[PDB]
Tab-separated table of N, CA and C in Angstrom:
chain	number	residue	atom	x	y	z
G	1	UNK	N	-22.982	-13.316	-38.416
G	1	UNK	CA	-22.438	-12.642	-37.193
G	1	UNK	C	-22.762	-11.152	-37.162
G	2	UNK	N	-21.899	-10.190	-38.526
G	2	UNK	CA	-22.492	-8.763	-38.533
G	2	UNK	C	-23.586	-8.394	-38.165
G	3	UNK	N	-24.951	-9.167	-38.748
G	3	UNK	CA	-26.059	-9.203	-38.803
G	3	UNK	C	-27.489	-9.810	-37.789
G	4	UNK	N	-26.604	-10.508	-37.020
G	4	UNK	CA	-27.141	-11.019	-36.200
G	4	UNK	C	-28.587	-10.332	-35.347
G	5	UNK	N	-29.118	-11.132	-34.817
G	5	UNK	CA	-30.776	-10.520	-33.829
G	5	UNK	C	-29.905	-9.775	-32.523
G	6	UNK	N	-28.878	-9.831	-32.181
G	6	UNK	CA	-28.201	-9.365	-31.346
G	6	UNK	C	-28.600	-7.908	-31.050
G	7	UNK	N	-28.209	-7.231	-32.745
G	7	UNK	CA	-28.378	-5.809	-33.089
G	7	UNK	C	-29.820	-5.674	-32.387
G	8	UNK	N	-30.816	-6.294	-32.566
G	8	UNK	CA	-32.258	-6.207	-32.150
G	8	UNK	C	-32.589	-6.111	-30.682
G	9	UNK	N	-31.833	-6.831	-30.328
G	9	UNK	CA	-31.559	-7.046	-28.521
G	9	UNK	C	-31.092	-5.977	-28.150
G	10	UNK	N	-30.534	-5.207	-28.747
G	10	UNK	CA	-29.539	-3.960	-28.065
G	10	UNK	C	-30.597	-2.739	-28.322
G	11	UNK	N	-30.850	-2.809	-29.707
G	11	UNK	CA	-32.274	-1.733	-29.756
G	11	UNK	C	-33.144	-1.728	-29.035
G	12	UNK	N	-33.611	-2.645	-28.780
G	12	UNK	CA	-34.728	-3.009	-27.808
G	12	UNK	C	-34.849	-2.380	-26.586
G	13	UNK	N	-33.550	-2.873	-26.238
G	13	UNK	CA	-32.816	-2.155	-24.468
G	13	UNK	C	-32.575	-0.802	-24.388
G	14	UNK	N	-32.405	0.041	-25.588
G	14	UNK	CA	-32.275	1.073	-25.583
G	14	UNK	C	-33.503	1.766	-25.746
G	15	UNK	N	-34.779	1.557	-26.781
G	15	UNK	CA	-35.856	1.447	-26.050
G	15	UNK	C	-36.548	1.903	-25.210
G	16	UNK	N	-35.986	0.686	-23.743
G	16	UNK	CA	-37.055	1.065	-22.468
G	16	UNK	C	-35.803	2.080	-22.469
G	17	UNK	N	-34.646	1.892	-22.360
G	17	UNK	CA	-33.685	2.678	-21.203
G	17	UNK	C	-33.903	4.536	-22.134
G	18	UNK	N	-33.675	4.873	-23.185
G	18	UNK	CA	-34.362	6.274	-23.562
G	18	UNK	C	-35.794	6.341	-23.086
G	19	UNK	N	-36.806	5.472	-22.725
G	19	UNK	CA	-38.145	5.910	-22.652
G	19	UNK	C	-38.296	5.922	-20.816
G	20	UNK	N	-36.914	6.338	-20.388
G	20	UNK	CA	-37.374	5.928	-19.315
G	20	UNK	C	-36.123	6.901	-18.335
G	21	UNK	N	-36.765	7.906	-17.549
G	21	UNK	CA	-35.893	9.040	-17.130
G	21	UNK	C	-35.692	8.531	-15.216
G	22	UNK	N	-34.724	8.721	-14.952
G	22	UNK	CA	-34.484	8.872	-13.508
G	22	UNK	C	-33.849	10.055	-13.014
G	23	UNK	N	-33.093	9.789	-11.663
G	23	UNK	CA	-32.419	10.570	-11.201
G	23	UNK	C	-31.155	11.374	-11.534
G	24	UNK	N	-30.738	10.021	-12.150
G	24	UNK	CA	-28.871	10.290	-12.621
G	24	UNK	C	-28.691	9.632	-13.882
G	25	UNK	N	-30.164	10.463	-15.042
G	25	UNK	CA	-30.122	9.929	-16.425
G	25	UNK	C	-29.334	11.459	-17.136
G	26	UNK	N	-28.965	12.184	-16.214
G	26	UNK	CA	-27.868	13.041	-16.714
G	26	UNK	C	-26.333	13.235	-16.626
G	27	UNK	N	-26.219	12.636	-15.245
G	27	UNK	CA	-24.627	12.027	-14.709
G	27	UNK	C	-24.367	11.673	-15.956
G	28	UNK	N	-22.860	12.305	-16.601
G	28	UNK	CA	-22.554	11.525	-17.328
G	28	UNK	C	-21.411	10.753	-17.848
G	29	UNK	N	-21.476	10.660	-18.648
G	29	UNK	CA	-20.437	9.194	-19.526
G	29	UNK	C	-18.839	9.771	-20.348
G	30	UNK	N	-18.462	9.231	-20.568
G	30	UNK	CA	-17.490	9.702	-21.403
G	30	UNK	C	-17.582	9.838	-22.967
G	31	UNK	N	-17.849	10.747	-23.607
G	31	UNK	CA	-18.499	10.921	-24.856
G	31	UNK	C	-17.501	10.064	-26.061
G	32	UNK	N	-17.656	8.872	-25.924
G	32	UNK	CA	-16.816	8.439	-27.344
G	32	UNK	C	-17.071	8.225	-28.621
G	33	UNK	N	-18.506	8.630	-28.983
G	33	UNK	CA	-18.848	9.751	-29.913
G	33	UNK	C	-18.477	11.047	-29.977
G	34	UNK	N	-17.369	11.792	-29.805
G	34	UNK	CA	-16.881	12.991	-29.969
G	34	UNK	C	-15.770	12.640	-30.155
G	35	UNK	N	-15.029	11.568	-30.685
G	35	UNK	CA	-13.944	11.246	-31.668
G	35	UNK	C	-14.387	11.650	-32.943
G	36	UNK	N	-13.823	11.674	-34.053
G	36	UNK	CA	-13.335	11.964	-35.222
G	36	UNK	C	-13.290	10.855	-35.820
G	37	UNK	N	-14.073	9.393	-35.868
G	37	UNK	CA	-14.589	8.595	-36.384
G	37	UNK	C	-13.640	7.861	-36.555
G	38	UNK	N	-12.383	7.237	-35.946
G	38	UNK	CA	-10.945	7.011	-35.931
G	38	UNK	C	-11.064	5.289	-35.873
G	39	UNK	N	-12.316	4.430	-35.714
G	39	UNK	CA	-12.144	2.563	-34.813
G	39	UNK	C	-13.063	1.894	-35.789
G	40	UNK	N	-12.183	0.637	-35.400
G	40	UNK	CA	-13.141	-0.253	-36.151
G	40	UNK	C	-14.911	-0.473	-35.577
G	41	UNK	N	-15.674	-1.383	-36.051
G	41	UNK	CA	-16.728	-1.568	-35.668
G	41	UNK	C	-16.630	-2.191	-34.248
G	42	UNK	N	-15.618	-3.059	-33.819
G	42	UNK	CA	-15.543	-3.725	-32.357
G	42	UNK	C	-14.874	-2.941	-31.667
G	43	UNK	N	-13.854	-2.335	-32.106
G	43	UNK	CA	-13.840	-1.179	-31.105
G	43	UNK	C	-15.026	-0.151	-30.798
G	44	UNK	N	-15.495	0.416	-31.654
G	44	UNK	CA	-16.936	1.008	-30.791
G	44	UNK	C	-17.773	0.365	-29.931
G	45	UNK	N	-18.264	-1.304	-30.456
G	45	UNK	CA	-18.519	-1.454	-29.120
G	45	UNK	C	-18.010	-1.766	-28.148
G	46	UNK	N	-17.113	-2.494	-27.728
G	46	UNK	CA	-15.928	-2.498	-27.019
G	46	UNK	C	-15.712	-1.221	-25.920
G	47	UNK	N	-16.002	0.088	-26.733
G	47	UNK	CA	-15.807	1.359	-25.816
G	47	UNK	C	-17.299	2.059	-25.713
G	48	UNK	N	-18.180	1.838	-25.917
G	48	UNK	CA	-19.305	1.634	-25.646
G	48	UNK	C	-20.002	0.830	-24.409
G	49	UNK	N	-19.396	-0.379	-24.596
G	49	UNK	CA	-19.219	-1.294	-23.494
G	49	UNK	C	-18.645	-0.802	-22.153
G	50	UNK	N	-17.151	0.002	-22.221
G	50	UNK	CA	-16.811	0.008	-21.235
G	50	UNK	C	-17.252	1.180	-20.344
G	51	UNK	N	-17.507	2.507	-21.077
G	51	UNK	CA	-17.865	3.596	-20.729
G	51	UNK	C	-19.627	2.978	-19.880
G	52	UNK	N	-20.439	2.182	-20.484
G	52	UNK	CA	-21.284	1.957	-20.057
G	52	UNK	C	-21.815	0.824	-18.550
G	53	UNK	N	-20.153	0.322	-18.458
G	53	UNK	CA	-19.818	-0.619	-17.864
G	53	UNK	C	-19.415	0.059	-16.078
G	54	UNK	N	-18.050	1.125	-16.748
G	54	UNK	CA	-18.321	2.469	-15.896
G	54	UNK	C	-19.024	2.784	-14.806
G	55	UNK	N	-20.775	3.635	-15.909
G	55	UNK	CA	-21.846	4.052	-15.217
G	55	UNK	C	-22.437	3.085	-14.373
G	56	UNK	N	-22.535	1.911	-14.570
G	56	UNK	CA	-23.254	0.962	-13.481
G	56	UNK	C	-22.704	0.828	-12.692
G	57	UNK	N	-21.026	0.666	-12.618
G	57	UNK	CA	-20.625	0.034	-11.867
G	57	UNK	C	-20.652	1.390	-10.517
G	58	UNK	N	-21.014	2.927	-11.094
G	58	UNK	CA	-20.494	3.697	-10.494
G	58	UNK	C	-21.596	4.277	-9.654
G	59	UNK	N	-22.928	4.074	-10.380
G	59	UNK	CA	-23.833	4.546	-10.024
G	59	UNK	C	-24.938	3.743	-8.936
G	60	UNK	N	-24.807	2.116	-9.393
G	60	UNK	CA	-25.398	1.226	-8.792
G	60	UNK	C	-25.932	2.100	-7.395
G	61	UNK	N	-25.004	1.761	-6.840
G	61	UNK	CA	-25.130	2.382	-5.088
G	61	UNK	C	-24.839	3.734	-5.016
G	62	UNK	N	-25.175	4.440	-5.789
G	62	UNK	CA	-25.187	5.889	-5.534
G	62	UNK	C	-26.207	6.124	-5.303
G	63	UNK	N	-26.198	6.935	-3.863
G	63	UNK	CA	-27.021	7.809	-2.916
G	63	UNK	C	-27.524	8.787	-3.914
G	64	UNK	N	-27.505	9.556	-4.828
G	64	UNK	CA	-28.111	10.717	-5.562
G	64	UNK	C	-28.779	9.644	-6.437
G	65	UNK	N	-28.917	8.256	-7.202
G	65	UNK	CA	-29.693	7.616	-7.397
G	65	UNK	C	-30.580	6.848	-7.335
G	66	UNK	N	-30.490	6.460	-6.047
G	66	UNK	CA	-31.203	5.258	-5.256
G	66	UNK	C	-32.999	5.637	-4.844
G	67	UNK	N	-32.950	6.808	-4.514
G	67	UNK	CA	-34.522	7.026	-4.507
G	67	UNK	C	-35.027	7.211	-3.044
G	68	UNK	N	-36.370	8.320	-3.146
G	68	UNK	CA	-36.880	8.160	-2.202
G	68	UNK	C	-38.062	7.162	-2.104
G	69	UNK	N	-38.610	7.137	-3.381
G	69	UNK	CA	-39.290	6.751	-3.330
G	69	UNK	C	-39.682	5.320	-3.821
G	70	UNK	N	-41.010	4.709	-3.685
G	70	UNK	CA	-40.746	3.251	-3.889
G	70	UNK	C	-40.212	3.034	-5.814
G	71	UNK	N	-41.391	4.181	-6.547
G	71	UNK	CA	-41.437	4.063	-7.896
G	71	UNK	C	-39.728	4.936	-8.290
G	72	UNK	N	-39.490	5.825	-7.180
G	72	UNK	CA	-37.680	6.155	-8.300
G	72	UNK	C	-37.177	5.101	-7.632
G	73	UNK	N	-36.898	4.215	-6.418
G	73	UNK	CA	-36.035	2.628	-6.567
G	73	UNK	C	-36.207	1.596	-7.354
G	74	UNK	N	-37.486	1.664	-8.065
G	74	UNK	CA	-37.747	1.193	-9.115
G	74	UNK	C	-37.581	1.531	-10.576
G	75	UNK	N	-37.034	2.366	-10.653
G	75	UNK	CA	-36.936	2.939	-12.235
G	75	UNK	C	-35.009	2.418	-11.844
G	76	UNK	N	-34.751	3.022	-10.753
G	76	UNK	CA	-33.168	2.811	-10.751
G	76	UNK	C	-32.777	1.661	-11.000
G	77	UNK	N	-33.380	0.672	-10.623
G	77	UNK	CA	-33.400	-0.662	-10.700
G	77	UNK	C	-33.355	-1.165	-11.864
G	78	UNK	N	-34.105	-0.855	-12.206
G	78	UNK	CA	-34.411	-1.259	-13.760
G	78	UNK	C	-33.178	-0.535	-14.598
G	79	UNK	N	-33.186	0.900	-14.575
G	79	UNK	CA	-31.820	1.300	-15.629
G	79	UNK	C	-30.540	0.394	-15.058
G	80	UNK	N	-30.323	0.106	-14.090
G	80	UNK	CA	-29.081	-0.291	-13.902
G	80	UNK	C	-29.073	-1.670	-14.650
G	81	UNK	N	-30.428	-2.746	-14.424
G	81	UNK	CA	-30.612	-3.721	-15.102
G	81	UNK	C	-30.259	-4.022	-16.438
G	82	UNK	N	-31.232	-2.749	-17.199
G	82	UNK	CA	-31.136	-2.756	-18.501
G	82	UNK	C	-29.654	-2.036	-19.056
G	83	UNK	N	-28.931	-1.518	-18.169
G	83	UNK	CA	-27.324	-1.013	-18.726
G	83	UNK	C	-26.395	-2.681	-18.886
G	84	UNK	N	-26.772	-3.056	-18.188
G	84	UNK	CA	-26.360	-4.744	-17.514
G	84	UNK	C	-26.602	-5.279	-18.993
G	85	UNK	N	-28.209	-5.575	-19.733
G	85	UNK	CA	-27.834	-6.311	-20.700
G	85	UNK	C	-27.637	-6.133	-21.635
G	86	UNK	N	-27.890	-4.444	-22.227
G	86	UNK	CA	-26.879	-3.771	-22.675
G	86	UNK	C	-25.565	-4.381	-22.823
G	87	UNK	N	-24.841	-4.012	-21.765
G	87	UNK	CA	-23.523	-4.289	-21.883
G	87	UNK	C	-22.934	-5.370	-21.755
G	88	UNK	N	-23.960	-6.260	-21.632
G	88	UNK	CA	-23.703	-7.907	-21.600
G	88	UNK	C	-23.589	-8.086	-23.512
G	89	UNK	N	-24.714	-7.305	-24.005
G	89	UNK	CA	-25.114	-7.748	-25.774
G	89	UNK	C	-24.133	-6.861	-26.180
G	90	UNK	N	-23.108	-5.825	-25.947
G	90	UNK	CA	-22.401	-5.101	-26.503
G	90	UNK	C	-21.129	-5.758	-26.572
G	91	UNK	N	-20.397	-6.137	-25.449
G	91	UNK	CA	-19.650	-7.185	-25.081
G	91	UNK	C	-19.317	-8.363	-25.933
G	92	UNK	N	-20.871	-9.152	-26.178
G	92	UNK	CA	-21.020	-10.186	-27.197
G	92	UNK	C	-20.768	-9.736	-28.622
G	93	UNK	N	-21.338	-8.213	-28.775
G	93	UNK	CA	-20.702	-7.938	-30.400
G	93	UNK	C	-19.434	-7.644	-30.029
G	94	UNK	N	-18.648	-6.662	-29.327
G	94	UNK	CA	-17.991	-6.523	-29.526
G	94	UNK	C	-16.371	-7.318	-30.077
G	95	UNK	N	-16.718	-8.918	-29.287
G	95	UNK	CA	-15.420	-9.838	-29.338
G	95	UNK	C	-13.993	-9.251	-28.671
G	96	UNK	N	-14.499	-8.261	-27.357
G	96	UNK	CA	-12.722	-7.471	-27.475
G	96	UNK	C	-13.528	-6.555	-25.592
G	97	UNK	N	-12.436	-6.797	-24.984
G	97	UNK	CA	-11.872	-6.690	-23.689
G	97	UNK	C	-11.459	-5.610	-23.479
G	98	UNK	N	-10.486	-4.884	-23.997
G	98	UNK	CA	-9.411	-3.841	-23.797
G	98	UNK	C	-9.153	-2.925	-25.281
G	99	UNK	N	-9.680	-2.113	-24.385
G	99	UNK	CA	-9.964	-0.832	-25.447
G	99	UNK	C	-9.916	0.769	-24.901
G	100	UNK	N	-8.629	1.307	-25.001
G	100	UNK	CA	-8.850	2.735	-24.225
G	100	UNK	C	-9.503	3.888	-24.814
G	101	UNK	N	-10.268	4.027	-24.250
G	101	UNK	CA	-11.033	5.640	-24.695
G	101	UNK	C	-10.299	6.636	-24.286
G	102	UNK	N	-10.290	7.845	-25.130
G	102	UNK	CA	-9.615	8.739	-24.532
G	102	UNK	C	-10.027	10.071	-24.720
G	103	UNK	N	-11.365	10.282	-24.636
G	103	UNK	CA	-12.247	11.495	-24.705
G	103	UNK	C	-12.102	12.333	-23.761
G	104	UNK	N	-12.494	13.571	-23.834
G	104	UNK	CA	-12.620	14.572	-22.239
G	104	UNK	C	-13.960	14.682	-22.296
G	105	UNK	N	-14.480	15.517	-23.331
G	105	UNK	CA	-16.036	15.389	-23.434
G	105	UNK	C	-16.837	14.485	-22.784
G	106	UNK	N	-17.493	14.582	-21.848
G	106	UNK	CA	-18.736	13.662	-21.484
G	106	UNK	C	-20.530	14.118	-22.096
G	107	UNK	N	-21.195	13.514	-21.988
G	107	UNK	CA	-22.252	13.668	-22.435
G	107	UNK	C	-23.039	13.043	-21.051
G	108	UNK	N	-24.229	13.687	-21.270
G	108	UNK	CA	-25.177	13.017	-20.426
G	108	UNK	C	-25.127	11.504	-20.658
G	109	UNK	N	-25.694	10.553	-19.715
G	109	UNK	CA	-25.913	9.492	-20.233
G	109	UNK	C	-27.193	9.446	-21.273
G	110	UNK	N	-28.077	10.399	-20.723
G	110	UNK	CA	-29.147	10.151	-21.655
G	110	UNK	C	-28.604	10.249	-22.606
G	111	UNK	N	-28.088	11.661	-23.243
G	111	UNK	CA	-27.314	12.032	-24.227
G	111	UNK	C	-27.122	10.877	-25.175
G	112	UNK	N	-26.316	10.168	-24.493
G	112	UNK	CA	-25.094	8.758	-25.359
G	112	UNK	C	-25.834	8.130	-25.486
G	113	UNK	N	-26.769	7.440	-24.698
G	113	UNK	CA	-27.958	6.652	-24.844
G	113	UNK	C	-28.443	6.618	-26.744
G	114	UNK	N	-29.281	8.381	-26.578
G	114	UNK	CA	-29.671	8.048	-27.680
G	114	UNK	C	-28.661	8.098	-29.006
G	115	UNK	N	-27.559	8.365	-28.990
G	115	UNK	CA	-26.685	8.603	-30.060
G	115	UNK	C	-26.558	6.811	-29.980
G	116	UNK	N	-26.278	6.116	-29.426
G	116	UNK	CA	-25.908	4.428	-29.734
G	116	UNK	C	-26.895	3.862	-30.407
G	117	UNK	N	-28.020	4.475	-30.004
G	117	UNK	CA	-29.525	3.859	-30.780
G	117	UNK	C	-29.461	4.655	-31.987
G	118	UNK	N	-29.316	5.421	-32.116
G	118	UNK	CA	-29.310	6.226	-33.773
G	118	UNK	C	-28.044	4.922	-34.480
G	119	UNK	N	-26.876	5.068	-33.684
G	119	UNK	CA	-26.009	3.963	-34.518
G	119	UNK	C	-26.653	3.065	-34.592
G	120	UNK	N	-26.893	2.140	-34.029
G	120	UNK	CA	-27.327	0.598	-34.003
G	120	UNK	C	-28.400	0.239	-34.673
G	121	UNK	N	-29.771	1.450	-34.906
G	121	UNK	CA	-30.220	1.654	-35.818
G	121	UNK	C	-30.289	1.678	-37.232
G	122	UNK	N	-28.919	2.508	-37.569
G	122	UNK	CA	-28.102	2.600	-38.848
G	122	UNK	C	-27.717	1.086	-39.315
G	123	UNK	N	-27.189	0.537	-37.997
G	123	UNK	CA	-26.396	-0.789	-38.449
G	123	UNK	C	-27.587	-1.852	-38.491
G	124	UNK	N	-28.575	-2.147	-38.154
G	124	UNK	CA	-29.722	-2.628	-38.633
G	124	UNK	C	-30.012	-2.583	-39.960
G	125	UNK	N	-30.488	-0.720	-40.097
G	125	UNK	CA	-31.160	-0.402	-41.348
G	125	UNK	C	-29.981	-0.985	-42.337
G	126	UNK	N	-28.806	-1.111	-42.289
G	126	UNK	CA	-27.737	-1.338	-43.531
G	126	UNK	C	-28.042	-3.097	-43.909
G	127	UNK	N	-28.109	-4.002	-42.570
G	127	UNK	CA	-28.470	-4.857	-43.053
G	127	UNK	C	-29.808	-5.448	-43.154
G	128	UNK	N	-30.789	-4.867	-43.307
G	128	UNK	CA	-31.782	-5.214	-43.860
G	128	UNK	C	-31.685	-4.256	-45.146
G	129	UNK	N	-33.107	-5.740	-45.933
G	129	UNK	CA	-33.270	-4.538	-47.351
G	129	UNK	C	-33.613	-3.367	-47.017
């Protein structure tokens, strides 16, 4: 379970979604990396999940994201996609629904982006040799 290809699925997605800039890849998130290292492993993703759950739900149809053009409705498209299975594979690790964050700090999304991939990274590299 810890170990699962899951972890791989989530790297992956993070990936295109850091290699890949839009409009409102700075709008941001609620930094729950700027805790004091306080949760279990399902609670991070769990609040990972939701903060990321959030941005789609908030940004989807946002006018400052949507694009003029054919290629930025297409990049938007796609981040919102890839936040989707993201937070579909975060969800699946996480095992857990209800989880309050309670940060003030926000970060860019890019920002958080890459700090989850540095984690998830970590949690890879631990379980492999």
């Amino acid at each position: 379970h810890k170990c699962d290809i899951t972890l791989q699925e989530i790297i992956k997605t993070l990936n295109s979604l850091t290699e890949q800039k839009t409009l409102c890849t700075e709008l941001t998130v609620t930094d729950i990396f700027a805790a004091s290292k306080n949760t279990t492993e399902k609670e991070t993703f769990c609040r990972a999940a939701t903060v990321l759950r959030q941005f789609y739900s908030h940004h989807e149809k946002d006018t400052r994201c949507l694009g003029a053009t054919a290629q930025q409705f297409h990049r938007h498209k796609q981040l919102i996609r890839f936040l989707k299975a993201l937070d579909r594979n975060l969800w699946g690790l996480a095992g857990l629904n209800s989880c309050p964050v309670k940060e003030a700090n926000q970060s860019t999304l890019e920002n958080f982006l890459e700090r989850l991939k540095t984690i998830m990274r970590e949690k890879y590299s631990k379980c492999s040799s």
